[PDB]
Amino acid sequence: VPLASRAACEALKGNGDMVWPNAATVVEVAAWRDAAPATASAAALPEHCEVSGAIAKRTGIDGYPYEIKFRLRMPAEWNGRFFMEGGSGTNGSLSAATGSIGGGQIASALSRNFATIATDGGHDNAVNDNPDALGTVAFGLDPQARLDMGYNSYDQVTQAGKAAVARFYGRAADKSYFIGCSEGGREGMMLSQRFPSHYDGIVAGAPGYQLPKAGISGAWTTQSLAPAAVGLDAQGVPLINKSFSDADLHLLSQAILGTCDALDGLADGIVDNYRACQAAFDPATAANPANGQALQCVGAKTADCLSPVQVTAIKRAMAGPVNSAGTPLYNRWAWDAGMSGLSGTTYNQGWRSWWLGSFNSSANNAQRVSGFSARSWLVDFATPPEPMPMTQVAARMMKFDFDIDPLKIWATSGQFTQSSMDWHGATSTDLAAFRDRGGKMILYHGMSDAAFSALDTADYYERLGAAMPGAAGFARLFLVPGMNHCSGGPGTDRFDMLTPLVAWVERGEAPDQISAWSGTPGYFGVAARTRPLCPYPQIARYKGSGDINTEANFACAAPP
Ligand SMILES: [Ca+2]
């Protein structure tokens, strides 16, 4: 049976000789795939072996079925590297598994002759959909499905993929790479902390390393925004979406650019000096730079000012949750131009969908008010889980208690033997074993992400530098001004993180910069804008002359 062959693939399927690290591995599919042509939306895919199946098929304490699904793609002609893509939301879907590299790239890892694997995280959105437990978050009712969503799925699938690669090619992967954003960023940080030898290079974008506190931020932003809300929904809950119109947010963005844009030495619609900007900008006293007057309404509301009740609300929301002792429960958020943005008539919805939701609606549709995020908190991250009908959820965020409810992400209860911060949190700065075997980590984060605070990622990185002096030799953070959650918004949101990760791990060449470019250069009225991403705490500084949309006219440097 020759290696890297149609027969080697088929043989992975019986009483055949394949030895899985987990004896409860079942292969459903082992198929040979012809090389696929490039399309408008994807690079050409090489000829490869597709293996799909499931690990640890079992019944939950909720009577639902559970398994850890995986999909593995092993090219006939292999570059010797193994690649795993991270998830998003609460997972539950099995992707095509060509190896997404994020940063809006056309190319998959499979398109570069990597072996590629993905998992659903140990539940299935089609089968683990419980109308009495808020839908696709229903996995949280099973304790093991929690541990699988947190850490165990990624572990079992990594071991199984590497075993499948070793058998199919008759040698082990020279190096292994993981790339994820959001929940996938949490997974990459979890891997560096709990499974240091699983991956040699990790890219962790907009990482939910404190994901169980998102619901607490969410409750807070909701309660903070309820006073500026106009009108009610069917259940009598204020319409958080009506707190700010798209034009209102655009004004907020224009006022932030007014005080902050030029602090990097260049008026360009981009706040490169995020730190000077947080020191300098207060919506209660800043100028609307169009009419020279206070951003905050002196009299009645107009198009060209925001009301006191609105300034109060957004300020309280961005400061972040505290309990009655005044202990911070998450973190504060960065003022940035990416809270809105204009391309043609189109208003950036990227920022507002998280806390406010769509202005144009009879109902609340915010992620953190009534959407997936608030539901996930109640069923997945609170112990014990609080299932309820979907229409009670927004009310529950309004009547959330910052002294009782936050304790529940630290709590254990009956069969829930680990807290959500135990199994989902990835807060450890003990990365010595990762560092010392030659592991490299690239973190990136959009400054205008409303899912997770770029400044919370930065504080993790400060705490990593303090615990492990010299940390920049193995881990670097690239903050992206303007960028929303993983993509979108008025910034250079597009980049190839994979090439510089491979260079760091294999050649020891640290990224002093990473080229990025805007997916919507409409926001700056140009056809193209390219800029260096800079390693924290460095920022992009214009050299003094040249086209402002060209990366060669920018250096990475310390802030003034
Ligand atoms: Ca600027």
Side-chain angles (χ1 to χ4, degrees):
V1 160
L3 306 165
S5 76
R6 180 173 337 239
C9 190
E10 145 95 82
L12 290 169
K13 182 88 164 58
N15 199 110
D17 26 345
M18 176 52 202
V19 184
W20 297 99
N22 196 313
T25 304
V26 171
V27 170
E28 305 293 333
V29 184
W32 201 247
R33 304 306 194 192
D34 300 339
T39 69
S41 26
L45 295 184
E47 183 186 27
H48 70 273
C49 166
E50 187 192 336
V51 172
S52 70
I55 304 171
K57 157 83 161 274
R58 73 199 163 78
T59 299
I61 66 166
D62 59 352
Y64 283 72
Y66 291 94
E67 58 184 28
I68 298 148
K69 297 192 200 312
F70 65 97
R71 181 172 281 120
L72 166 69
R73 286 186 192 275
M74 292 188 295
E77 299 158 57
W78 182 46
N79 69 6
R81 306 179 177 80
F82 176 83
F83 181 98
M84 177 171 193
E85 53 173 62
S88 42
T90 53
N91 291 343
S93 48
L94 192 60
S95 77
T98 60
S100 174
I101 70 176
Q105 296 303 111
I106 271 296
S108 65
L110 179 61
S111 69
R112 310 170 169 202
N113 292 278
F114 286 80
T116 66
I117 193 153
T119 182
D120 64 358
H123 60 281
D124 178 354
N125 291 323
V127 167
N128 303 115
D129 184 337
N130 182 341
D132 301 330
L134 298 182
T136 61
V137 297
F139 67 101
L141 294 195
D142 182 66
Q144 185 54 56
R146 284 183 171 211
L147 307 190
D148 299 340
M149 174 61 185
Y151 65 86
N152 179 62
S153 62
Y154 320 94
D155 186 25
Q156 298 293 330
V157 165
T158 300
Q159 282 183 250
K162 284 200 200 179
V165 161
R167 177 40 116 62
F168 182 72
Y169 296 110
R171 61 183 185 95
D174 302 310
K175 302 295 175 142
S176 291
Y177 297 92
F178 179 104
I179 297 195
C181 195
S182 172
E183 157 67 10
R186 178 204 76 81
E187 293 155 18
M189 281 184 68
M190 178 275 292
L191 283 163
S192 69
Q193 296 170 202
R194 185 186 284 262
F195 303 113
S197 72
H198 272 207
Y199 295 97
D200 300 300
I202 299 168
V203 165
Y209 79 99
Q210 303 209 257
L211 227 173
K213 289 174 186 191
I216 301 170
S217 178
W220 177 260
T221 58
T222 297
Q223 288 183 26
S224 294
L225 286 163
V230 186
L232 308 177
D233 71 29
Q235 287 73 35
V237 176
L239 293 172
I240 313 303
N241 42 141
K242 306 299 209 166
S243 73
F244 286 79
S245 74
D246 294 348
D248 295 351
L249 283 187
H250 185 57
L251 185 46
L252 186 35
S253 150
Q254 293 286 73
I256 285 155
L257 286 173
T259 133
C260 291
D261 187 354
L263 306 172
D264 35 72
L266 215 198
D268 53 4
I270 293 177
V271 192
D272 277 287
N273 196 350
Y274 53 93
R275 287 308 189 187
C277 179
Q278 304 325 294
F281 178 79
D282 185 353
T285 78
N288 175 340
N291 63 14
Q293 297 189 208
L295 166 74
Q296 184 169 66
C297 290
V298 162
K301 172 132 222 322
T302 84
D304 311 281
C305 64
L306 289 173
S307 71
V309 152
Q310 286 180 318
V311 178
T312 290
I314 192 55
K315 275 157 72 82
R316 197 175 107 118
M318 301 284 282
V322 300
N323 61 9
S324 17
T327 327
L329 294 181
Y330 177 60
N331 213 322
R332 87 295 199 183
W333 305 77
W335 302 118
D336 197 57
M339 300 172 72
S340 213
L342 203 37
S343 222
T345 22
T346 308
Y347 276 129
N348 177 7
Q349 305 292 311
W351 189 89
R352 70 168 293 128
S353 58
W354 290 102
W355 311 347
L356 286 65
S358 300
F359 186 97
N360 244 274
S361 180
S362 170
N364 287 297
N365 53 303
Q367 286 287 92
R368 299 280 217 248
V369 178
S370 71
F372 295 111
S373 177
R375 315 223 266 266
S376 178
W377 192 83
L378 290 164
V379 172
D380 304 326
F381 304 139
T383 313
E386 298 184 17
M388 67 194 51
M390 303 227 293
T391 56
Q392 292 184 204
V393 164
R396 184 63 181 81
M397 300 312 302
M398 278 299 288
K399 61 137 184 306
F400 188 104
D401 190 331
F402 292 97
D403 287 329
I404 305 319
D405 280 318
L407 301 186
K408 300 179 166 143
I409 72 172
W410 308 100
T412 61
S413 170
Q415 294 187 280
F416 298 89
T417 62
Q418 292 187 36
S419 74
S420 60
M421 287 291 296
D422 290 334
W423 52 260
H424 218 48
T427 60
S428 169
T429 60
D430 188 13
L431 267 46
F434 177 74
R435 178 197 53 195
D436 289 345
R437 65 178 310 279
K440 307 301 179 186
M441 184 180 267
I442 294 169
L443 300 141
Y444 70 83
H445 210 313
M447 299 292 329
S448 295
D449 196 319
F452 311 121
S453 170
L455 299 175
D456 195 47
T457 293
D459 284 339
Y460 173 83
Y461 185 74
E462 293 280 6
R463 282 191 303 271
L464 185 66
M468 289 192 258
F474 86 89
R476 276 167 191 209
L477 170 52
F478 299 83
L479 294 164
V480 204
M483 178 178 135
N484 301 141
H485 188 44
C486 287
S487 80
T492 65
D493 60 321
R494 296 210 181 156
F495 38 73
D496 169 4
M497 288 300 177
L498 183 57
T499 299
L501 188 63
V502 170
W504 203 1
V505 170
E506 291 179 15
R507 297 333 201 177
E509 165 162 290
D512 295 323
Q513 29 177 34
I514 298 161
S515 317
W517 68 86
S518 175
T520 319
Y523 286 125
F524 316 120
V526 286
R529 182 173 271 168
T530 73
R531 295 297 184 84
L533 299 189
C534 293
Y536 184 103
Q538 297 188 346
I539 65 174
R541 196 237 275 136
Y542 183 58
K543 306 236 222 174
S545 86
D547 185 324
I548 59 153
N549 308 99
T550 298
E551 152 175 19
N553 303 331
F554 292 80
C556 280

Tab-separated table of all heavy atoms in Angstrom, residues 260-262 264 266-272, ligand 1:
chain	number	residue	atom	x	y	z
A	260	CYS	N	-8.415	63.048	17.883
A	260	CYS	CA	-7.469	61.892	17.963
A	260	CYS	C	-6.676	61.658	16.671
A	260	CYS	O	-5.496	61.339	16.806
A	260	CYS	CB	-8.186	60.613	18.378
A	260	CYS	SG	-8.760	60.649	20.099
A	261	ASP	N	-7.284	61.811	15.487
A	261	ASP	CA	-6.696	61.463	14.157
A	261	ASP	C	-5.263	61.987	13.985
A	261	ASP	O	-4.389	61.214	13.527
A	261	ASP	CB	-7.577	61.985	13.024
A	261	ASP	CG	-7.143	61.528	11.643
A	261	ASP	OD1	-6.076	60.886	11.535
A	261	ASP	OD2	-7.871	61.825	10.680
A	262	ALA	N	-5.030	63.249	14.323
A	262	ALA	CA	-3.782	63.994	14.060
A	262	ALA	C	-2.704	63.712	15.126
A	262	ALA	O	-1.537	64.097	14.907
A	262	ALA	CB	-4.127	65.463	13.964
A	264	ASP	N	-1.010	61.165	15.602
A	264	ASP	CA	0.032	60.283	14.987
A	264	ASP	C	0.862	61.075	13.972
A	264	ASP	O	1.776	60.470	13.363
A	264	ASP	CB	-0.559	59.028	14.317
A	264	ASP	CG	-1.912	59.208	13.636
A	264	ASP	OD1	-1.953	59.863	12.553
A	264	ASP	OD2	-2.920	58.705	14.211
A	266	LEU	N	-0.648	62.808	11.314
A	266	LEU	CA	-1.284	62.640	9.981
A	266	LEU	C	-2.801	62.523	10.097
A	266	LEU	O	-3.273	61.495	10.614
A	266	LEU	CB	-0.717	61.390	9.294
A	266	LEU	CG	-0.554	61.473	7.773
A	266	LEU	CD1	-0.423	60.084	7.164
A	266	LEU	CD2	-1.707	62.220	7.120
A	267	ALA	N	-3.520	63.496	9.539
A	267	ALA	CA	-4.992	63.472	9.401
A	267	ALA	C	-5.339	62.564	8.210
A	267	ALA	O	-5.083	62.977	7.069
A	267	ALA	CB	-5.532	64.882	9.243
A	268	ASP	N	-5.878	61.366	8.475
A	268	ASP	CA	-6.130	60.321	7.449
A	268	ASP	C	-7.364	59.464	7.756
A	268	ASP	O	-7.552	58.475	7.045
A	268	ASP	CB	-4.906	59.417	7.316
A	268	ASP	CG	-4.395	58.810	8.615
A	268	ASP	OD1	-5.029	59.010	9.710
A	268	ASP	OD2	-3.359	58.142	8.515
A	269	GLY	N	-8.217	59.824	8.715
A	269	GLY	CA	-9.356	58.973	9.130
A	269	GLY	C	-8.921	57.746	9.942
A	269	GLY	O	-9.781	56.865	10.184
A	270	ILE	N	-7.667	57.699	10.418
A	270	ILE	CA	-7.099	56.545	11.188
A	270	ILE	C	-6.418	57.037	12.472
A	270	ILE	O	-5.448	57.845	12.362
A	270	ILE	CB	-6.102	55.727	10.344
A	270	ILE	CG1	-6.791	55.007	9.180
A	270	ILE	CG2	-5.342	54.747	11.229
A	270	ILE	CD1	-5.830	54.264	8.286
A	271	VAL	N	-6.861	56.506	13.626
A	271	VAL	CA	-6.251	56.786	14.962
A	271	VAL	C	-5.166	55.747	15.267
A	271	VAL	O	-5.480	54.753	15.932
A	271	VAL	CB	-7.294	56.797	16.086
A	271	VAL	CG1	-6.680	57.373	17.356
A	271	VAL	CG2	-8.549	57.536	15.671
A	272	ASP	N	-3.938	56.007	14.837
A	272	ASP	CA	-2.776	55.120	15.043
A	272	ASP	C	-2.320	55.188	16.497
A	272	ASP	O	-1.842	54.135	16.995
A	272	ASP	CB	-1.634	55.463	14.094
A	272	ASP	CG	-1.809	54.814	12.730
A	272	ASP	OD1	-1.615	53.562	12.648
A	272	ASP	OD2	-2.146	55.560	11.774
B	1	CA	CA	-4.130	59.665	11.778
